[PDB]
């Protein structure tokens, strides 16, 4: 199903994650995006950064051309990268993403992160970046606009901007049973802003920014117990948890069997006791943890 966003558009509650590290051929994105749409995914998450918008857009166009879906059936997200925060760079970055994907509009365009980089850190008033995003919604380049990796103070900055025209529809953030963001989630619900969870299955544990000593979420013994109780899988428990707390959840997989498994999240539900057990795993663990950004002036986990 879908959640109604605060601008009246609708976002499917399960999303497909398209990021894969540079060792995976670019052409894999094309193949797995078509498999995702075949399995039932209708929300597809990409970004300028992922260097795959050509392949992702071609997958969506291929599934439109063969009659599987209409354009208005797909919710496609792209993201403005942090070297493009200066307001004059926002609409060109979005137009470039549209040309790569060969689409007329995105369903969602996000500020990918608040940590501005030189167009080496940069200092940019993100209120002015937001005004440029608003202009892209008014032009019809993006049906909806949102933010990603913002903390509550950063979100309030936008919500409190003089002459704000559109609130963010969402804040896409790292969110899973080790780092469940309840307080931020509550703040988002109080403003009718959707929290969208990434690394909901514990991240890809990329060696460039994730500590290999960190616990592997899908080997968690409480998730394994719940998967055995429901005869499902640790991944499906982790996804289902987000749906039941009102969080829209992404899931990346480049494996045909796991892509088809992940749509089963709609097939079962967890009890209040199961959900309390998963809530008991919260331990302030974000898998992103690198000197590369941890001392950025707008690092969101500084709090
Ligand atoms: N806004 C941002 O800054 C940001 C940051 C990070 C991620 N994201 C978005 O969120 C998406 C997902 O987050 P993520 O990349 O961190 O990965 P994720 O969804 O947490 O997935 C982690 C690993 O789970 C595996 N997996 C998937 N389904 C499974 C299943 N049913 N059973 C066992 N393992 C399974 C996948 O491996 P296999 O491929 O081998 O199946 C994947 O590499 C990204 O692709 C991107 O679209 C956004
Ligand atoms: C973690 C991560 C994973 C990816 C790839 C993706 O979007 O799939 N991105 C771009 C990041 C960030 O830039 C990021 C850096 C620091 C912080 Cl605090 C939050 C996000």
mmCIF file of C-alpha atoms and ligand atoms in Angstrom:
data_model
loop_
_atom_site.group_PDB
_atom_site.id
_atom_site.type_symbol
_atom_site.label_atom_id
_atom_site.label_comp_id
_atom_site.label_asym_id
_atom_site.label_seq_id
_atom_site.Cartn_x
_atom_site.Cartn_y
_atom_site.Cartn_z
ATOM 1 C CA UNK A 1 0.000 0.000 0.000
ATOM 2 C CA UNK A 2 0.817 3.759 0.034
ATOM 3 C CA UNK A 3 0.955 6.583 2.575
ATOM 4 C CA UNK A 4 -0.587 9.986 1.696
ATOM 5 C CA UNK A 5 2.123 12.647 1.894
ATOM 6 C CA UNK A 6 1.510 16.092 3.302
ATOM 7 C CA UNK A 7 1.321 17.603 -0.237
ATOM 8 C CA UNK A 8 -1.529 15.129 -1.207
ATOM 9 C CA UNK A 9 0.688 12.801 -3.363
ATOM 10 C CA UNK A 10 1.008 9.091 -2.417
ATOM 11 C CA UNK A 11 4.236 7.150 -1.689
ATOM 12 C CA UNK A 12 4.344 3.292 -1.736
ATOM 13 C CA UNK A 13 5.404 2.131 1.769
ATOM 14 C CA UNK A 14 7.959 -0.398 0.536
ATOM 15 C CA UNK A 15 10.766 0.920 -1.572
ATOM 16 C CA UNK A 16 13.527 -0.673 -3.630
ATOM 17 C CA UNK A 17 17.158 0.481 -2.771
ATOM 18 C CA UNK A 18 19.321 0.733 -5.935
ATOM 19 C CA UNK A 19 22.717 1.647 -4.504
ATOM 20 C CA UNK A 20 25.514 -0.873 -5.113
ATOM 21 C CA UNK A 21 29.232 -0.262 -4.629
ATOM 22 C CA UNK A 22 31.486 0.548 -7.616
ATOM 23 C CA UNK A 23 32.676 -3.065 -7.946
ATOM 24 C CA UNK A 24 29.178 -4.107 -9.149
ATOM 25 C CA UNK A 25 28.772 -3.505 -12.959
ATOM 26 C CA UNK A 26 26.455 -0.574 -13.732
ATOM 27 C CA UNK A 27 24.358 -2.878 -15.910
ATOM 28 C CA UNK A 28 23.337 -4.952 -12.816
ATOM 29 C CA UNK A 29 21.084 -1.982 -11.781
ATOM 30 C CA UNK A 30 19.060 -2.368 -14.970
ATOM 31 C CA UNK A 31 18.511 -6.090 -14.435
ATOM 32 C CA UNK A 32 17.636 -5.928 -10.698
ATOM 33 C CA UNK A 33 15.362 -2.914 -11.083
ATOM 34 C CA UNK A 34 13.290 -4.780 -13.637
ATOM 35 C CA UNK A 35 13.164 -7.829 -11.224
ATOM 36 C CA UNK A 36 12.058 -5.529 -8.404
ATOM 37 C CA UNK A 37 9.210 -4.122 -10.440
ATOM 38 C CA UNK A 38 8.271 -7.722 -11.545
ATOM 39 C CA UNK A 39 8.161 -8.779 -7.845
ATOM 40 C CA UNK A 40 5.756 -5.937 -6.970
ATOM 41 C CA UNK A 41 7.983 -2.998 -5.919
ATOM 42 C CA UNK A 42 6.499 0.337 -7.073
ATOM 43 C CA UNK A 43 8.838 2.786 -5.194
ATOM 44 C CA UNK A 44 12.374 2.904 -6.532
ATOM 45 C CA UNK A 45 15.045 4.887 -4.660
ATOM 46 C CA UNK A 46 18.027 6.322 -6.603
ATOM 47 C CA UNK A 47 20.273 9.396 -6.538
ATOM 48 C CA UNK A 48 22.784 11.341 -8.589
ATOM 49 C CA UNK A 49 25.509 9.802 -6.426
ATOM 50 C CA UNK A 50 24.703 6.175 -7.271
ATOM 51 C CA UNK A 51 25.817 6.605 -10.885
ATOM 52 C CA UNK A 52 22.964 4.288 -11.974
ATOM 53 C CA UNK A 53 20.137 6.657 -12.939
ATOM 54 C CA UNK A 54 20.567 5.691 -16.690
ATOM 55 C CA UNK A 55 20.029 2.014 -15.830
ATOM 56 C CA UNK A 56 17.320 2.606 -13.261
ATOM 57 C CA UNK A 57 15.370 4.889 -15.670
ATOM 58 C CA UNK A 58 15.802 2.385 -18.483
ATOM 59 C CA UNK A 59 14.466 -0.418 -16.278
ATOM 60 C CA UNK A 60 11.374 1.689 -15.458
ATOM 61 C CA UNK A 61 10.912 2.637 -19.157
ATOM 62 C CA UNK A 62 11.333 -1.004 -20.192
ATOM 63 C CA UNK A 63 8.557 -2.069 -17.739
ATOM 64 C CA UNK A 64 6.315 0.717 -19.058
ATOM 65 C CA UNK A 65 7.037 -0.256 -22.687
ATOM 66 C CA UNK A 66 6.196 -3.942 -22.144
ATOM 67 C CA UNK A 67 2.911 -2.945 -20.435
ATOM 68 C CA UNK A 68 3.654 -4.178 -16.879
ATOM 69 C CA UNK A 69 3.096 -0.705 -15.295
ATOM 70 C CA UNK A 70 2.146 2.816 -16.178
ATOM 71 C CA UNK A 71 4.408 5.755 -15.295
ATOM 72 C CA UNK A 72 1.898 6.911 -12.736
ATOM 73 C CA UNK A 73 2.233 3.449 -11.052
ATOM 74 C CA UNK A 74 5.944 3.994 -10.279
ATOM 75 C CA UNK A 75 7.246 6.300 -7.506
ATOM 76 C CA UNK A 76 10.790 7.247 -8.506
ATOM 77 C CA UNK A 77 13.102 9.149 -6.111
ATOM 78 C CA UNK A 78 16.291 10.961 -6.893
ATOM 79 C CA UNK A 79 18.508 13.059 -4.626
ATOM 80 C CA UNK A 80 20.505 16.281 -4.953
ATOM 81 C CA UNK A 81 24.147 15.530 -4.028
ATOM 82 C CA UNK A 82 25.856 17.747 -1.434
ATOM 83 C CA UNK A 83 28.239 19.533 -3.899
ATOM 84 C CA UNK A 84 25.001 21.054 -5.414
ATOM 85 C CA UNK A 85 23.442 22.757 -2.325
ATOM 86 C CA UNK A 86 24.079 26.297 -3.620
ATOM 87 C CA UNK A 87 20.589 27.335 -4.708
ATOM 88 C CA UNK A 88 21.464 28.109 -8.381
ATOM 89 C CA UNK A 89 22.796 24.518 -8.796
ATOM 90 C CA UNK A 90 19.627 22.718 -7.554
ATOM 91 C CA UNK A 91 17.399 22.838 -10.620
ATOM 92 C CA UNK A 92 20.221 22.065 -13.082
ATOM 93 C CA UNK A 93 21.168 19.001 -10.907
ATOM 94 C CA UNK A 94 17.599 17.805 -11.008
ATOM 95 C CA UNK A 95 17.309 18.378 -14.765
ATOM 96 C CA UNK A 96 20.537 16.375 -15.206
ATOM 97 C CA UNK A 97 19.081 13.464 -13.196
ATOM 98 C CA UNK A 98 15.911 13.602 -15.348
ATOM 99 C CA UNK A 99 17.998 13.480 -18.566
ATOM 100 C CA UNK A 100 20.063 10.523 -17.246
ATOM 101 C CA UNK A 101 16.914 8.621 -16.371
ATOM 102 C CA UNK A 102 15.082 9.931 -19.453
ATOM 103 C CA UNK A 103 12.005 10.774 -17.391
ATOM 104 C CA UNK A 104 9.841 13.885 -17.459
ATOM 105 C CA UNK A 105 9.662 14.199 -13.649
ATOM 106 C CA UNK A 106 10.639 12.502 -10.413
ATOM 107 C CA UNK A 107 8.014 11.570 -7.893
ATOM 108 C CA UNK A 108 10.391 12.700 -5.133
ATOM 109 C CA UNK A 109 13.471 14.790 -4.984
ATOM 110 C CA UNK A 110 15.485 14.936 -1.755
ATOM 111 C CA UNK A 111 18.311 16.933 -0.379
ATOM 112 C CA UNK A 112 20.622 13.836 -0.010
ATOM 113 C CA UNK A 113 22.292 15.122 3.111
ATOM 114 C CA UNK A 114 22.737 18.331 5.111
ATOM 115 C CA UNK A 115 26.533 18.094 4.949
ATOM 116 C CA UNK A 116 27.404 20.596 2.240
ATOM 117 C CA UNK A 117 30.558 19.908 0.164
ATOM 118 C CA UNK A 118 32.695 22.258 -1.983
ATOM 119 C CA UNK A 119 31.058 22.739 -5.462
ATOM 120 C CA UNK A 120 36.329 19.726 1.710
ATOM 121 C CA UNK A 121 33.208 21.076 3.361
ATOM 122 C CA UNK A 122 31.165 24.084 2.251
ATOM 123 C CA UNK A 123 28.847 26.389 4.259
ATOM 124 C CA UNK A 124 25.481 26.889 2.590
ATOM 125 C CA UNK A 125 22.261 28.181 4.027
ATOM 126 C CA UNK A 126 20.073 25.087 3.488
ATOM 127 C CA UNK A 127 17.009 27.347 3.698
ATOM 128 C CA UNK A 128 18.083 28.770 0.303
ATOM 129 C CA UNK A 129 18.625 25.237 -1.036
ATOM 130 C CA UNK A 130 15.093 24.451 0.111
ATOM 131 C CA UNK A 131 13.654 27.492 -1.734
ATOM 132 C CA UNK A 132 15.271 26.171 -4.879
ATOM 133 C CA UNK A 133 13.672 22.747 -4.214
ATOM 134 C CA UNK A 134 10.293 24.434 -3.812
ATOM 135 C CA UNK A 135 10.795 26.071 -7.223
ATOM 136 C CA UNK A 136 11.389 22.548 -8.714
ATOM 137 C CA UNK A 137 8.127 21.370 -7.290
ATOM 138 C CA UNK A 138 6.311 24.458 -8.708
ATOM 139 C CA UNK A 139 7.898 23.764 -12.162
ATOM 140 C CA UNK A 140 6.638 20.145 -12.061
ATOM 141 C CA UNK A 141 10.161 18.652 -12.182
ATOM 142 C CA UNK A 142 9.447 16.881 -8.870
ATOM 143 C CA UNK A 143 5.923 16.013 -7.660
ATOM 144 C CA UNK A 144 7.198 16.025 -4.083
ATOM 145 C CA UNK A 145 10.285 17.346 -2.301
ATOM 146 C CA UNK A 146 11.907 16.084 0.899
ATOM 147 C CA UNK A 147 15.136 15.843 2.870
ATOM 148 C CA UNK A 148 17.478 13.033 3.897
ATOM 149 C CA UNK A 149 19.848 12.603 6.857
ATOM 150 C CA UNK A 150 18.387 15.608 8.664
ATOM 151 C CA UNK A 151 18.152 15.612 12.448
ATOM 152 C CA UNK A 152 15.329 17.284 14.325
ATOM 153 C CA UNK A 153 17.157 20.694 14.648
ATOM 154 C CA UNK A 154 17.894 20.635 10.881
ATOM 155 C CA UNK A 155 14.301 19.798 10.039
ATOM 156 C CA UNK A 156 12.983 22.555 12.372
ATOM 157 C CA UNK A 157 15.277 24.995 10.561
ATOM 158 C CA UNK A 158 13.281 24.321 7.385
ATOM 159 C CA UNK A 159 9.840 24.119 9.074
ATOM 160 C CA UNK A 160 10.569 27.471 10.738
ATOM 161 C CA UNK A 161 11.811 29.296 7.579
ATOM 162 C CA UNK A 162 10.102 32.686 6.931
ATOM 163 C CA UNK A 163 7.667 32.324 3.952
ATOM 164 C CA UNK A 164 7.987 28.526 3.663
ATOM 165 C CA UNK A 165 5.887 27.246 0.788
ATOM 166 C CA UNK A 166 6.113 23.423 1.042
ATOM 167 C CA UNK A 167 7.116 21.366 4.036
ATOM 168 C CA UNK A 168 9.367 18.403 3.347
ATOM 169 C CA UNK A 169 7.126 15.372 2.687
ATOM 170 C CA UNK A 170 9.735 13.064 4.240
ATOM 171 C CA UNK A 171 13.086 12.649 5.946
ATOM 172 C CA UNK A 172 14.978 9.601 4.743
ATOM 173 C CA UNK A 173 17.391 8.515 7.499
ATOM 174 C CA UNK A 174 19.286 5.486 8.724
ATOM 175 C CA UNK A 175 16.709 3.478 10.756
ATOM 176 C CA UNK A 176 16.684 -0.156 11.907
ATOM 177 C CA UNK A 177 16.338 -2.041 15.236
ATOM 178 C CA UNK A 178 19.862 -0.943 16.363
ATOM 179 C CA UNK A 179 19.156 2.718 15.731
ATOM 180 C CA UNK A 180 15.354 2.991 15.617
ATOM 181 C CA UNK A 181 15.078 6.812 15.790
ATOM 182 C CA UNK A 182 11.886 6.737 17.957
ATOM 183 C CA UNK A 183 12.149 10.341 19.129
ATOM 184 C CA UNK A 184 12.836 11.672 15.621
ATOM 185 C CA UNK A 185 10.039 9.433 14.347
ATOM 186 C CA UNK A 186 7.670 10.982 16.922
ATOM 187 C CA UNK A 187 8.736 14.484 15.870
ATOM 188 C CA UNK A 188 8.188 13.625 12.204
ATOM 189 C CA UNK A 189 4.706 12.156 12.926
ATOM 190 C CA UNK A 190 3.848 15.358 14.884
ATOM 191 C CA UNK A 191 4.573 17.396 11.724
ATOM 192 C CA UNK A 192 2.991 14.954 9.162
ATOM 193 C CA UNK A 193 6.455 14.281 7.684
ATOM 194 C CA UNK A 194 7.143 10.606 6.686
ATOM 195 C CA UNK A 195 10.230 8.926 8.054
ATOM 196 C CA UNK A 196 11.752 6.751 5.326
ATOM 197 C CA UNK A 197 14.236 4.131 6.653
ATOM 198 C CA UNK A 198 17.430 3.216 4.843
ATOM 199 C CA UNK A 199 19.895 0.502 5.990
ATOM 200 C CA UNK A 200 16.743 -1.106 7.344
ATOM 201 C CA UNK A 201 18.387 -4.494 6.789
ATOM 202 C CA UNK A 202 21.611 -3.383 8.530
ATOM 203 C CA UNK A 203 23.397 -1.627 5.598
ATOM 204 C CA UNK A 204 25.734 -3.160 2.999
ATOM 205 C CA UNK A 205 28.562 -2.867 5.569
ATOM 206 C CA UNK A 206 30.661 -0.994 2.984
ATOM 207 C CA UNK A 207 34.343 -1.122 4.200
ATOM 208 C CA UNK A 208 34.819 2.580 3.313
ATOM 209 C CA UNK A 209 32.536 3.776 6.174
ATOM 210 C CA UNK A 210 31.158 0.854 8.271
ATOM 211 C CA UNK A 211 33.148 -0.772 11.017
ATOM 212 C CA UNK A 212 33.341 -4.563 10.286
ATOM 213 C CA UNK A 213 33.295 -5.132 14.108
ATOM 214 C CA UNK A 214 29.745 -3.680 14.203
ATOM 215 C CA UNK A 215 26.965 -6.292 14.893
ATOM 216 C CA UNK A 216 25.432 -7.832 11.769
ATOM 217 C CA UNK A 217 21.753 -6.861 12.102
ATOM 218 C CA UNK A 218 20.355 -9.884 10.256
ATOM 219 C CA UNK A 219 22.266 -12.302 12.585
ATOM 220 C CA UNK A 220 20.559 -10.730 15.581
ATOM 221 C CA UNK A 221 19.241 -13.503 17.907
ATOM 222 C CA UNK A 222 16.011 -11.722 18.729
ATOM 223 C CA UNK A 223 15.266 -11.192 14.997
ATOM 224 C CA UNK A 224 16.221 -14.824 14.373
ATOM 225 C CA UNK A 225 13.797 -15.962 17.132
ATOM 226 C CA UNK A 226 10.947 -13.839 15.673
ATOM 227 C CA UNK A 227 11.676 -15.145 12.172
ATOM 228 C CA UNK A 228 11.399 -18.713 13.571
ATOM 229 C CA UNK A 229 8.187 -17.894 15.475
ATOM 230 C CA UNK A 230 6.573 -16.434 12.276
ATOM 231 C CA UNK A 231 8.339 -18.864 9.890
ATOM 232 C CA UNK A 232 9.677 -15.901 7.920
ATOM 233 C CA UNK A 233 13.222 -14.503 7.780
ATOM 234 C CA UNK A 234 15.223 -11.989 9.906
ATOM 235 C CA UNK A 235 15.019 -9.511 6.940
ATOM 236 C CA UNK A 236 11.254 -9.736 6.746
ATOM 237 C CA UNK A 237 10.981 -9.145 10.534
ATOM 238 C CA UNK A 238 13.152 -6.042 10.235
ATOM 239 C CA UNK A 239 11.043 -4.704 7.335
ATOM 240 C CA UNK A 240 7.744 -5.537 8.983
ATOM 241 C CA UNK A 241 8.795 -3.722 12.153
ATOM 242 C CA UNK A 242 9.159 -0.444 10.207
ATOM 243 C CA UNK A 243 5.756 -0.794 8.499
ATOM 244 C CA UNK A 244 4.038 -1.320 11.881
ATOM 245 C CA UNK A 245 5.607 1.838 13.341
ATOM 246 C CA UNK A 246 4.426 3.994 10.443
ATOM 247 C CA UNK A 247 7.885 4.164 8.778
ATOM 248 C CA UNK A 248 8.251 3.721 4.981
ATOM 249 C CA UNK A 249 11.011 1.207 4.443
ATOM 250 C CA UNK A 250 13.559 0.751 1.679
ATOM 251 C CA UNK A 251 15.269 -2.605 0.952
ATOM 252 C CA UNK A 252 18.217 -2.993 -1.329
ATOM 253 C CA UNK A 253 18.891 -6.360 -2.855
ATOM 254 C CA UNK A 254 20.682 -7.311 -6.070
ATOM 255 C CA UNK A 255 19.728 -11.041 -5.641
ATOM 256 C CA UNK A 256 16.662 -12.364 -7.467
ATOM 257 C CA UNK A 257 15.415 -14.598 -4.611
ATOM 258 C CA UNK A 258 15.794 -11.923 -1.884
ATOM 259 C CA UNK A 259 14.101 -9.246 -4.049
ATOM 260 C CA UNK A 260 11.037 -11.590 -4.366
ATOM 261 C CA UNK A 261 11.203 -12.491 -0.666
ATOM 262 C CA UNK A 262 11.130 -8.827 0.479
ATOM 263 C CA UNK A 263 7.632 -8.182 -0.923
ATOM 264 C CA UNK A 264 6.335 -10.794 1.543
ATOM 265 C CA UNK A 265 6.498 -8.076 4.141
ATOM 266 C CA UNK A 266 2.772 -7.465 3.383
ATOM 267 C CA UNK A 267 1.872 -11.102 4.145
ATOM 268 C CA UNK A 268 2.109 -11.289 7.967
ATOM 269 C CA UNK A 269 2.164 -9.087 11.022
ATOM 270 C CA UNK A 270 4.025 -8.845 14.306
ATOM 271 C CA UNK A 271 2.322 -8.716 17.715
ATOM 272 C CA UNK A 272 2.712 -5.930 20.342
ATOM 273 C CA UNK A 273 5.098 -8.273 22.258
ATOM 274 C CA UNK A 274 7.167 -8.921 19.095
ATOM 275 C CA UNK A 275 7.361 -5.175 18.487
ATOM 276 C CA UNK A 276 8.429 -4.503 22.103
ATOM 277 C CA UNK A 277 11.171 -7.147 21.746
ATOM 278 C CA UNK A 278 12.485 -5.457 18.602
ATOM 279 C CA UNK A 279 12.226 -2.016 20.310
ATOM 280 C CA UNK A 280 14.473 -3.556 23.068
ATOM 281 C CA UNK A 281 17.389 -3.865 20.494
ATOM 282 C CA UNK A 282 17.789 -0.030 20.197
ATOM 283 C CA UNK A 283 21.390 0.810 21.006
ATOM 284 C CA UNK A 284 22.331 4.107 19.285
ATOM 285 C CA UNK A 285 24.242 2.233 16.602
ATOM 286 C CA UNK A 286 24.582 3.948 13.252
ATOM 287 C CA UNK A 287 26.481 1.799 10.689
ATOM 288 C CA UNK A 288 27.789 4.992 9.029
ATOM 289 C CA UNK A 289 30.710 5.901 11.297
ATOM 290 C CA UNK A 290 33.706 7.443 9.460
ATOM 291 C CA UNK A 291 36.183 10.304 10.098
ATOM 292 C CA UNK A 292 35.159 11.407 6.551
ATOM 293 C CA UNK A 293 31.997 13.199 7.898
ATOM 294 C CA UNK A 294 31.918 12.785 11.604
ATOM 295 C CA UNK A 295 33.450 16.195 12.151
ATOM 296 C CA UNK A 296 31.430 17.995 9.447
ATOM 297 C CA UNK A 297 29.745 21.167 10.938
ATOM 298 C CA UNK A 298 26.357 19.693 9.975
ATOM 299 C CA UNK A 299 26.960 16.100 10.906
ATOM 300 C CA UNK A 300 23.542 14.993 11.947
ATOM 301 C CA UNK A 301 24.519 12.571 14.718
ATOM 302 C CA UNK A 302 26.233 15.333 16.759
ATOM 303 C CA UNK A 303 22.622 15.776 18.004
HETATM 304 N N1 LIG B 1 19.697 8.783 1.886
HETATM 305 C C1 LIG B 1 20.946 8.228 2.082
HETATM 306 O O1 LIG B 1 21.929 8.877 2.452
HETATM 307 C C2 LIG B 1 21.024 6.721 1.970
HETATM 308 C C3 LIG B 1 22.063 6.006 2.621
HETATM 309 C C4 LIG B 1 22.105 4.615 2.528
HETATM 310 C C5 LIG B 1 21.174 3.922 1.799
HETATM 311 N N2 LIG B 1 20.133 4.684 1.111
HETATM 312 C C6 LIG B 1 19.095 4.061 0.227
HETATM 313 O O2 LIG B 1 18.549 2.931 0.945
HETATM 314 C C7 LIG B 1 18.799 1.775 0.207
HETATM 315 C C8 LIG B 1 18.918 0.593 1.197
HETATM 316 O O3 LIG B 1 19.872 0.748 2.295
HETATM 317 P P1 LIG B 1 21.279 -0.032 2.148
HETATM 318 O O4 LIG B 1 21.952 0.137 0.854
HETATM 319 O O5 LIG B 1 22.062 0.389 3.301
HETATM 320 O O6 LIG B 1 21.042 -1.575 2.239
HETATM 321 P P2 LIG B 1 19.882 -2.451 3.101
HETATM 322 O O7 LIG B 1 18.482 -2.270 2.588
HETATM 323 O O8 LIG B 1 20.067 -2.246 4.596
HETATM 324 O O9 LIG B 1 20.310 -3.953 2.718
HETATM 325 C C9 LIG B 1 21.506 -4.482 3.341
HETATM 326 C C10 LIG B 1 21.825 -5.876 2.641
HETATM 327 O O10 LIG B 1 20.658 -6.663 2.914
HETATM 328 C C11 LIG B 1 20.673 -7.691 1.910
HETATM 329 N N3 LIG B 1 19.283 -8.284 1.855
HETATM 330 C C12 LIG B 1 18.279 -7.747 1.177
HETATM 331 N N4 LIG B 1 17.184 -8.505 1.342
HETATM 332 C C13 LIG B 1 17.561 -9.555 2.131
HETATM 333 C C14 LIG B 1 16.909 -10.701 2.576
HETATM 334 N N5 LIG B 1 15.555 -10.880 2.350
HETATM 335 N N6 LIG B 1 17.655 -11.575 3.335
HETATM 336 C C15 LIG B 1 18.952 -11.427 3.624
HETATM 337 N N7 LIG B 1 19.651 -10.346 3.163
HETATM 338 C C16 LIG B 1 18.927 -9.426 2.407
HETATM 339 C C17 LIG B 1 21.181 -7.064 0.625
HETATM 340 O O11 LIG B 1 22.221 -7.936 0.092
HETATM 341 P P3 LIG B 1 21.942 -8.602 -1.396
HETATM 342 O O12 LIG B 1 21.981 -7.492 -2.420
HETATM 343 O O13 LIG B 1 23.051 -9.657 -1.591
HETATM 344 O O14 LIG B 1 20.568 -9.342 -1.389
HETATM 345 C C18 LIG B 1 21.810 -5.739 1.125
HETATM 346 O O15 LIG B 1 23.092 -5.510 0.533
HETATM 347 C C19 LIG B 1 20.066 2.122 -0.638
HETATM 348 O O16 LIG B 1 20.242 1.150 -1.692
HETATM 349 C C20 LIG B 1 19.715 3.521 -1.103
HETATM 350 O O17 LIG B 1 18.676 3.388 -2.108
HETATM 351 C C21 LIG B 1 20.058 6.071 1.191
HETATM 352 C C1 LIG B 2 25.812 6.507 4.926
HETATM 353 C C2 LIG B 2 25.680 6.713 3.399
HETATM 354 C C3 LIG B 2 25.402 5.730 2.497
HETATM 355 C C4 LIG B 2 25.317 6.285 1.237
HETATM 356 C C5 LIG B 2 25.061 5.688 -0.143
HETATM 357 C C6 LIG B 2 23.525 5.707 -0.354
HETATM 358 O O1 LIG B 2 22.881 6.839 -0.402
HETATM 359 O O2 LIG B 2 23.063 4.571 -0.613
HETATM 360 N N1 LIG B 2 25.421 7.748 1.419
HETATM 361 C C7 LIG B 2 25.499 8.826 0.370
HETATM 362 C C8 LIG B 2 25.727 7.969 2.789
HETATM 363 C C9 LIG B 2 26.019 9.396 3.297
HETATM 364 O O3 LIG B 2 26.511 10.223 2.522
HETATM 365 C C10 LIG B 2 25.929 9.723 4.737
HETATM 366 C C11 LIG B 2 27.138 10.137 5.318
HETATM 367 C C12 LIG B 2 26.992 10.449 6.703
HETATM 368 C C13 LIG B 2 25.797 10.389 7.382
HETATM 369 CL CL1 LIG B 2 25.774 10.810 9.041
HETATM 370 C C14 LIG B 2 24.595 9.954 6.790
HETATM 371 C C15 LIG B 2 24.692 9.641 5.414
#
